[PDB]
Design a binder for this molecule. Structure first.
Ligand SMILES: *[C@@H]1O[C@H](CO)[C@@H](O)[C@H](O)[C@H]1NC(C)=O
Ligand SMILES: *[C@@H]1O[C@H](CO)[C@@H](O)[C@H](O)[C@H]1NC(C)=O
Lengths: 105, 105
């Protein structure tokens, strides 16, 4: 895959999660967008690296708020927050990412 | 919680997943909608029970197609298909459900 990434979820709704991605060089990236509950948010990589904060709540600059919370079929002890990112390439099919953070409740 | 539900995922993209829910009686339900890649799909419960098919592909009546596939940060051996459902109640906050099915790739 052309992208290295992970999500670092927080323990508290006031502390945003951090979405971190690095592009692997050529074929290059046309654009990258994150679908957030508050709208579609573009991402730019400086020299191929980006760290994005994703907020669990609305309280509060390019901001992206998680979709959620969601209930999950098996476990009644957690809820899901999520967004999705789409990065389009100059040549090829797009990469679609699922960014998931569970929070207690 | 006011709803009993689970998702039965399939092993093959030609076989849809089945979303199954039963309402627990009073306070009643105003409406229920599923956000699908092909649009917003309403759900009616007959006597409080519903089984809905969710298709992984477009090939093919009230149809709902999963959003996806999505890549996941840790595992490169699977992709995610998903949709979300919102059921509104006569009195109270809405119930939001996350319906997730992983498929190999
Ligand atoms: C599922 O429920 C268990 C407890 O029953 C919990 O420890 C676990 O974190 C839950 N799974 C997720 C993905 O949160
Ligand atoms: C995560 O990857 C492992 C193998 O590394 C796989 O067996 C497992 O099904 C994956 N998790 C999910 C949720 O698919």
């Amino acid at each position: 895959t052309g992208i290295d990434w992970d999500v670092f979820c927080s323990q508290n709704e006031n502390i945003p999660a951090k979405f971190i991605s690095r592009l692997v060089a050529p074929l290059a990236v046309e654009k990258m967008d994150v679908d957030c509950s508050n709208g579609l948010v573009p991402i730019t990589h400086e020299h191929g690296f980006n760290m994005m904060l994703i907020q669990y709540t609305r309280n509060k600059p390019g901001m992206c708020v998680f979709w959620g919370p969601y209930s999950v079929p098996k476990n009644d002890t957690v809820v899901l927050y999520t967004v999705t990112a789409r990065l389009k390439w100059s040549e090829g099919p797009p990469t679609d990412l699922s960014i998931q953070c569970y929070m207690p409740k």
